[PDB]
């Protein structure tokens, strides 16, 4: 329900459309039901994207690593263009949808028109496309952000340029870079960081020797531990546990 109220951009609430959009914008949106069909299709797509996100993250964590900080580009665009979002928006949601779709086709990681290549490209930028469409949902643009068209396409150019800088250059010594970039936090991290506890706590003994045996897997580790989950009421009952 919160996702619907935050991402639907319902067009029936005429007072809401008068407050958010201009009179020409609301009359064109209400006249063209095809625009409303595109918004409903986008809402179904982002619902499927929400399902995909709940599949890929069973954990309830919303922190992710991403090349761009889109909230900061929204803030920078707003304070550059002097939006003053008390006034209603001057940009059409159909313009927002075509711009975000054009950007989604703009960014490329895998070239070629092989269907395998296109599937690999879409799986590569699958999460990022979902995130950028989620940020560029028409409800949030029309209500929360209220950017102009010049701000919007300047923003699209900025995102494309930032991602173009964010691509990985070839020939970088990535393997030695990664080996060093994992060796350094081992130098910072201490084997004495484990201060133990009153309980046994299965003798976790994480640290330098733990990372040692993970680097060279030993057939007999010092503490081979196993974590066990039960099915149901057997775990729910302490006696059955």
């Amino acid at each position: 329900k919160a996702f619907e109220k935050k991402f639907r951009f319902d067009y029936t609430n005429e007072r809401a459309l008068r407050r958010t959009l201009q009179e020409d914008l609301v009359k064109d949106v209400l006249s063209n039901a095809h625009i409303q069909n595109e918004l409903e299709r986008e809402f179904e797509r982002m619902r499927e994207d929400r399902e995909v996100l709940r599949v890929i993250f069973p954990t309830g964590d919303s922190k992710v690593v991403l090349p761009c900080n889109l909230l900061r580009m929204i803030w920078n665009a707003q304070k550059i263009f002097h939006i003053n979002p008390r006034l209603p928006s001057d940009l059409h949601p159909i313009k927002v949808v075509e711009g975000v779709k054009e950007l989604s086709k703009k960014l490329v990681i895998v070239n070629g028109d092989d269907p395998l290549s296109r599937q690999a490209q879409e799986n590569a930028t699958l999460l990022f496309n979902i995130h950028l469409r989620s940020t560029l949902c028409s409800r949030r643009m029309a209500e929360e952000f209220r950017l102009s068209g010049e701000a919007f396409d300047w923003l699209l150019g900025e995102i494309e340029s930032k991602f173009n800088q964010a691509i990985a250059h070839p020939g970088e010594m990535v393997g030695a870079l990664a080996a060093q970039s994992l060796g350094e936090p081992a130098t910072q991290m201490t084997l004495n960081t484990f201060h133990y506890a009153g309980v046994s706590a299965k003798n976790v003994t994480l640290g330098v020797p733990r990372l040692k045996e993970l680097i060279n897997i030993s057939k007999k580790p010092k503490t081979p531990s196993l974590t066990v989950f039960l099915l149901g009421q057997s775990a729910r009952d302490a006696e059955r546990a």
Partner: peptide, 10 residues
Amino acid sequence: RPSETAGRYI
């Protein structure tokens, strides 16, 4: 495979 940083990997 499910990918933490990219959604899916093949």
